[PDB]
Design a protein around this ligand. Sequence first.
Ligand SMILES: [Mg+2]
Ligand SMILES: [Mg+2]
Ligand SMILES: [Mg+2]
Ligand SMILES: [Mg+2]
Ligand SMILES: [Zn+2]
Lengths: 130, 37, 136, 135, 94
Amino acid sequence: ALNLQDKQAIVAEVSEVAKGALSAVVADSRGVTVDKMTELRKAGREAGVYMRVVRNTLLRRAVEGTPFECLKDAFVGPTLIAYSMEHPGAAARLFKEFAKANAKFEVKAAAFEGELIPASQIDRLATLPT
Amino acid sequence: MKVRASVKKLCRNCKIVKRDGVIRVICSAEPKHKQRQ
Amino acid sequence: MLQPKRTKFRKMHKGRNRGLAQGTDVSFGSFGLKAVGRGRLTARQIEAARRAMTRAVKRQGKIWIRVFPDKPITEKPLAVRMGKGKGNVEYWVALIQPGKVLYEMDGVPEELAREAFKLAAAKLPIKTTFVTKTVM
Amino acid sequence: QAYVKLQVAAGMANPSPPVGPALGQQGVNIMEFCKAFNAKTDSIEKGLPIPVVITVYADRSFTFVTKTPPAAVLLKKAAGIKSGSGKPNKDKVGKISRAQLQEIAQTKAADMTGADIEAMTRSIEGTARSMGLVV
Amino acid sequence: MFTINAEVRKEQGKGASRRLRAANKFPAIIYGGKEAPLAIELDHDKVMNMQAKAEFYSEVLTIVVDGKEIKVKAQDVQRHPYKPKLQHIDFVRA
RNA sequence: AGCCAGGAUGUUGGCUUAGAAGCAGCCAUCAUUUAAAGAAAGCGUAAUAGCUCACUGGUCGAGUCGGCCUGCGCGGAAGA
Ligand SMILES: [Mg+2]
Ligand SMILES: [Mg+2]
Ligand SMILES: [Mg+2]
Ligand SMILES: [Mg+2]
Ligand SMILES: [Zn+2]
């Protein structure tokens, strides 16, 4: 993450939540590769061949990289509150895959409080596709 | 317990320390690595 | 090993060992190991270092030796009283003055060349250290 | 759970003698084993094995979702010998060709996780050079 | 962008230049064409971090001596035979 | 650095392997999910099964990790 690579990362955190504006939590606390496939390969099969969640989850990697869109990002910094992005979606069906993968084989990484883009909570949101 | 005047590290857990005028080499999980200068 | 195929006359004097070097810089390849101390190199030590460094290069690249021993050192035989002449040549020695290079290498990269020259440094009586290829 | 591929030949029940009791160590029994073991292979042929995911249970009724034969052995019938590749840098024996893998990759395409064909062709060209059959 | 800041030596020769070598400096010479040989000193460690590039020996150098930015190129260099140092440089007026 | 959890498999590197699924070699080292899982740097066997290292996802509130030239010091250093 140099100057010329966090420039690409701020390009990513402009153009990645400019259209699908969701950020969330997933981290290697039940991180074993085949167990990680329960989120990763299933998100890849839900998407095309381009699945990218790729994470840079830290305290001081928040207020400098985010600040074009959704400036409530000051509650993602400490305590491993992570970075999961969806390029399409608006409280879509993938928003609760982390809740499903925590109810089934994960050990409460960072409570996954949704990062509050429609001012969400730790629960499945109401505006969910049925 | 070697005695040598050319001590070295071998594995990734060799901890050169200095106790009482002696440059000791020790390791956590190896009886053969244990040394003395 | 190396040895003269021919000397003009049989036995040479000792001389002395003053002066700086002549073959100072790297002249052929890319990497060099260069002497620092003052001393004397026999016929055996340089070919022993040649094997001990060829064993690390693993027949790759190319290496050059420049020093070649030609001084007919002698010995007086044991239990002979000191008179009655000089002695017969026992081995052939080179003279190394401070700064003279011994070997040069190309091809094989530098981080391998650190320990690949350190092994042949550890069989040599005078302290040497590494030098690089200088563009003028 | 318990996913490392090791099994026996096809048409012979009581599946010890290649491996031994390393399948039926625990309480999962031969009635549950054999009545799917030679029963599945009326859709998958005889000569090449079948990877079935074994799993140690406490409920004792083990299930089955099957898959496709492996490329540690299958490289024989796309090449032309059961055992051929002897020391392949000095005295060569075997080779593999280019385009004949659109069959092998994506005739069983729901089993493998990839839809691009040419990035999956070299993935078994590497297995040919992993058994010696250099191109 | 390679520059040189230097001044001119007082007394020349061996015994003076050895103390000038000891005091973090080293001699040079600037000759060529119409201007006479200028016999100056240089800074040692402030050009050790400049001779580490080939643009020293392939690029123009501007020396600030006598209030005159002379435009030179590197000509020849001597070195201590068993030290990582610099000894004496030539500079042509070209 | 310290406090959660990796350290895949495409894959079961294999020639015919006592056995073969990485470590006992002389076979590529590409790659599909690529944050990655080295068709592997060491344990274990009949090869192993699983847990171990980076790989990279963490946490953390002011400094750094290892090269050059030198001043000094330390061991190497057993006697009638
Ligand atoms: Mg004590
Ligand atoms: Mg001489
Ligand atoms: Mg004098
Ligand atoms: Mg006494
Ligand atoms: Zn040890």
